[PDB]
Amino acid sequence: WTATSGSCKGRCFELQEVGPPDCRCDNLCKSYSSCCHDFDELCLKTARGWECTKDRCGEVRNEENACHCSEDCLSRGDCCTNYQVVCKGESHWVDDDCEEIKVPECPAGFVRPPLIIFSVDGFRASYMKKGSKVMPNIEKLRSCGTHAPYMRPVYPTKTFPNLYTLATGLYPESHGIVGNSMYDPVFDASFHLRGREKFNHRWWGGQPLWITATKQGVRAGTFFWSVSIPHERRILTILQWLSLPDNERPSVYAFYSEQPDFSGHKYGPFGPEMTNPLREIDKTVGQLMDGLKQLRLHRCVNVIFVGDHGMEDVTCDRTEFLSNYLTNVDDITLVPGTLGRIRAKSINNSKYDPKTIIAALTCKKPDQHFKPYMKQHLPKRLHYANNRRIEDIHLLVDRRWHVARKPLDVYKKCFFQGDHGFDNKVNSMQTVFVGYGPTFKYRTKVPPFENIELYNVMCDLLGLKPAPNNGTHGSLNHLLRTNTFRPTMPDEVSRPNYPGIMYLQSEFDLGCTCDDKVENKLEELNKRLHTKGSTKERHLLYGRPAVLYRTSYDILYHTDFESGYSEIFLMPLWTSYTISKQAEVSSIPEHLTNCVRPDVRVSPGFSQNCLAYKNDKQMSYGFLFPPYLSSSPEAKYDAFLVTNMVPMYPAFKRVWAYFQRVLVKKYASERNGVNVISGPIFDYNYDGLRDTEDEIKQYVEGSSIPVPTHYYSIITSCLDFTQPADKCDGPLSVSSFILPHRPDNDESCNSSEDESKWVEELMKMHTARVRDIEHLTGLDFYRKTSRSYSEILTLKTYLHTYESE
Ligand SMILES: *[C@@H]1O[C@H](CO)[C@@H](O[C@@H]2O[C@H](CO)[C@@H](O[C@@H]3O[C@H](CO[C@H]4O[C@H](CO)[C@@H](O)[C@H](O[C@H]5O[C@H](CO)[C@@H](O)[C@H](O)[C@@H]5O[C@H]5O[C@H](CO)[C@@H](O)[C@H](O)[C@@H]5O)[C@@H]4O)[C@@H](O)[C@H](O[C@H]4O[C@H](CO)[C@@H](O)[C@H](O)[C@@H]4O[C@H]4O[C@H](CO)[C@@H](O)[C@H](O)[C@@H]4O)[C@@H]3O)[C@H](O)[C@H]2NC(C)=O)[C@H](O)[C@H]1NC(C)=O
Ligand SMILES: Cc1cc(OCc2n[nH]c(=O)n2C)c(-c2cccc(C(=O)N3CCOCC3)c2)cc1Cl
Ligand SMILES: [Ca+2]
Ligand SMILES: [Ca+2]
Ligand code: NA
Ligand code: NA
Ligand SMILES: [Zn+2]
Q: Which residues pair with 117 in a beta bridge?
A: 254, 304
Neighbours of ion ligand 3 (CB under 5 A): 121, 159, 261, 308
- Return the axis-axis angle of helices 454-461 and 159-168, rounded to nearest 10°: 50
> Considering only CA atoms, which of 427, 677, 662, 655 is closest in space to residue 540?
677
- C-alpha 689 to ligand 1 mean position (Å): 12
As a dihedral over the C-alpha atoms of residue 765, residue 769, residue 773, residue 774, rounded to 10 degrees, the angle is -170
CB within 8 Å of 256: residues ≥ 6 apart: 119, 120, 121, 223, 224, 225, 234
Indicate if ligand 2 lies below 6 Å from the C-beta of 160: yes
689 assigned to a ligand binding site: yes
* Residue owning the nearest CA to atom 40 of ligand 1: 174
Substitution site in 164, 168, 174 for ligand 1 pocket (most atoms within 8 Å of beta carbon): 174
DSSP assignment of 103-130 equals S----TT-SS--EEEEEEET--TTHHHH
396 assigned to a ligand binding site: no
CB within 8 Å of 768: residues ≥ 6 apart: 380, 381, 712, 736, 737, 738, 799
- Measured in angstroms, the resolution is 1.5
Measure the CA–CA gap between 585 and 657, rounded to whole angstroms.
12
Question: Residue 792 region, left (φ>0) first, then alpha (ψ -120 to 50), else beta?
Answer: alpha
Q: How many CB atoms lie within 10 A of CB 7?
A: 15
Measure the CA–CA gap between 344 and 329, rounded to whole angstroms.
10
* Ligand found nearest the CA of 648: 5
27 assigned to a ligand binding site: no
Alpha-carbon distances of 163 from 278, 666, 680, rounded to whole Å: 20, 40, 34
Side chain identity, residue 209:
L
User: Which string of b and e fits 114-138 if b means at least 16 CB within 10 Å?
Assistant: bbbbbbbbbbbbbbbeebeebbbbb
Side chain identity, residue 745:
N
Asked whether the beta carbons of 469 and 170 are under 8 A apart, the reply is yes
- Sign of the C-alpha dihedral, residues 185, 190, 191, 196? negative
- Return the axis-axis angle of helices 275-294 and 231-242, rounded to nearest 10°: 20
Asked if the peptide bond before residue 208 counts as cis, ω within 30 degrees of 0, the response is no
- C-alpha 192 to ligand 7 mean position (Å): 14
478 assigned to a ligand binding site: no
Find the helix or strand (DSSP H, E) in which 408 lies: helix 408-411
* Residue owning the nearest CA to atom 36 of ligand 1: 205
* Residue owning the nearest CA to atom 3 of ligand 2: 223
Q: How many CB atoms lie within 10 A of CB 702?
A: 11
Measure the CA–CA gap between 212 and 456, rounded to whole angstroms.
11
Asked whether the beta carbons of 644 and 563 are under 8 A apart, the reply is yes
Measure the CA–CA gap between 556 and 553, rounded to whole angstroms.
10
Cα angle, residue 298 at apex, residues 295 and 302 outer, rounded to 5°: 120
CB within 8 Å of 479: residues ≥ 6 apart: 146, 435, 440, 441, 444, 446, 457
Alpha-carbon distances of 425 from 9, 305, 788, rounded to whole Å: 49, 21, 28
- C-alpha 164 to ligand 2 mean position (Å): 7
- Helix (H, G, I), strand (E, B), or coil: what is residue 627? helix
Measure the CA–CA gap between 647 and 620, rounded to whole angstroms.
6
Measure the CA–CA gap between 504 and 643, rounded to whole angstroms.
16
- In 682-805, at which residue ranges do the beta strands (DSSP E only) sit? 710-718, 732-740, 767-768, 779-780
Side chain identity, residue 148:
A
Measure the CA–CA gap between 207 and 363, rounded to whole angstroms.
41
* Ligand found nearest the CA of 380: 1
Side chain identity, residue 764:
K
- C-alpha 743 to ligand 6 mean position (Å): 11
* Distance in angstroms between the alpha carbons of the first and the last residue of the chain: 55
Asked whether the beta carbons of 338 and 320 are under 8 A apart, the reply is no
CB within 8 Å of 95: residues ≥ 6 apart: none
Q: From the alpha carbon of 383, which atom of ligand 1 is closest?
A: 93
Q: How many CB atoms lie within 10 A of CB 739?
A: 23
431 assigned to a ligand binding site: no
- C-alpha 706 to ligand 5 mean position (Å): 14
* Ligand found nearest the CA of 383: 1
Substitution site in 175, 234, 256, 257 for ligand 2 pocket (most atoms within 8 Å of beta carbon): 256
- Return the axis-axis angle of helices 789-797 and 770-777, rounded to nearest 10°: 90
Quote the DSSP letter at residue 507: G
CB within 8 Å of 59: residues ≥ 6 apart: 68, 69, 70
Indicate if ligand 2 lies below 6 Å from the C-beta of 256: yes
> Considering only CA atoms, which of 60, 18, 72, 66 is closest in space to residue 42?
66
Asked if the peptide bond before residue 706 counts as cis, ω within 30 degrees of 0, the response is no
Measure the CA–CA gap between 232 and 80, rounded to whole angstroms.
10
Measure the CA–CA gap between 172 and 155, rounded to whole angstroms.
8
* Residue owning the nearest CA to atom 83 of ligand 1: 174
Side chain identity, residue 730:
G
Side chain identity, residue 41:
E
- Helix (H, G, I), strand (E, B), or coil: what is residue 735? strand
593 assigned to a ligand binding site: no
DSSP assignment of 471-498 equals S-TTTTGGGBSS------PPPP-BPPB-
Indicate if ligand 2 lies below 6 Å from the C-beta of 483: no
Long-range contacts of 693-702 (CB under 8 A, 24+ apart): 693/568, 693/569, 700/608, 700/612, 700/613, 700/616, 700/619, 700/647, 701/612, 701/615, 701/616, 701/617, 701/618, 701/619, 702/612, 702/615, 702/616
Side chain identity, residue 572:
P
> Considering only CA atoms, which of 459, 448, 569, 554 is closest in space to residue 502?
554
DSSP assignment of 414-445 equals ----EE--S-TTSGGG-B-EEEESTTBPSSEE
Backbone angles phi, psi at 360, to 5 degrees: -70, -15
Looking only at Cα atoms, what is the longest distance across the chain?
Answer: 106
> Considering only CA atoms, which of 27, 470, 13, 389 is closest in space to residue 207?
470
Find the helix or strand (DSSP H, E) in which 647 lies: strand 645-648
Q: How large is the C-alpha radius of gyration of the chain? A: 30
Q: From the alpha carbon of 117, which atom of ligand 2 is closest?
A: 1
Measure the CA–CA gap between 252 and 116, rounded to whole angstroms.
6
Give the 3-state secondary structure of 523-582.
Answer: HHHHHHHHHCCCCHHHHCCCCCCEECCCCCEEEEECCCCEEEEECCCCEEEEEEEEECCC
Q: Is 159 part of the annotated catalytic residue set?
A: yes
DSSP assignment of 203-266 equals G--S--HHHHHHHTT--B--SS--TTS-HHHHHHHHHHHHTS-TTT--SEEEEEEEEEHHHHHH
User: Which string of b and e fits 760-789 if b means at least 16 CB within 10 Å?
Assistant: bebbbbbbbbbbbbbbbbbbbbbbebeeeb
Q: Which residues pair with 711 in a beta bridge?
A: 680, 739
Q: Where are the alpha helices (DSSP H) in 697-758?
A: none
Measure the CA–CA gap between 254 and 120, rounded to whole angstroms.
11
Q: Which residues pair with 680 in a beta bridge?
A: 711
Q: Where are the alpha helices (DSSP H) in 152-201?
A: 159-168, 172-175
638 assigned to a ligand binding site: no
As a dihedral over the C-alpha atoms of residue 39, residue 43, residue 44, residue 47, rounded to 10 degrees, the angle is 120
Q: What share of the chain is helix, strand, coil (3-state, %, to 5)?
A: 30, 20, 50
Measure the CA–CA gap between 576 and 294, rounded to whole angstroms.
59
CB within 8 Å of 520: residues ≥ 6 apart: none
Measure the CA–CA gap between 378 and 386, rounded to whole angstroms.
11
Indicate if ligand 2 lies below 6 Å from the C-beta of 236: no
Backbone angles phi, psi at 629, to 5 degrees: -115, 20
* Ligand found nearest the CA of 752: 6
Q: From the alpha carbon of 121, which atom of ligand 2 is closest?
A: 13
Alpha-carbon distances of 635 from 379, 530, 573, 638, 643, rounded to whole Å: 36, 10, 22, 6, 15
Number of H helices, E strands in the chain: 23, 29
Measure the CA–CA gap between 780 and 548, rounded to whole angstroms.
7
Q: From the alpha carbon of 175, which atom of ligand 1 is closest?
A: 37
* Ligand found nearest the CA of 416: 7
Length of the chain: 805
Backbone angles phi, psi at 289, to 5 degrees: -70, -40
- Helix (H, G, I), strand (E, B), or coil: what is residue 60? coil
Residues having CB within 6 Å of any atom of ligand 1: 170-171, 173-176, 205-206, 383, 386-387, 468-470, 687-689, 775
- C-alpha 259 to ligand 3 mean position (Å): 9
Which residue out of 81, 146, 157, 159 is catalytically annotated?
159
Q: How many CB atoms lie within 10 A of CB 26?
A: 23
CB within 8 Å of 194: residues ≥ 6 apart: none
Q: How many CB atoms lie within 10 A of CB 695?
A: 14
Measure the CA–CA gap between 649 and 651, rounded to whole angstroms.
5
* Residue owning the nearest CA to atom 21 of ligand 2: 164
- C-alpha 225 to ligand 2 mean position (Å): 7
Q: From the alpha carbon of 256, which atom of ligand 2 is closest?
A: 6
Alpha-carbon distances of 698 from 322, 599, 644, 652, 704, rounded to whole Å: 33, 25, 20, 16, 9
> Considering only CA atoms, which of 15, 8, 45, 32 is closest in space to residue 229?
45
- C-alpha 180 to ligand 3 mean position (Å): 10
Substitution site in 117, 118, 163 for ligand 2 pocket (most atoms within 8 Å of beta carbon): 163
Alpha-carbon distances of 146 from 21, 114, 448, rounded to whole Å: 46, 17, 12
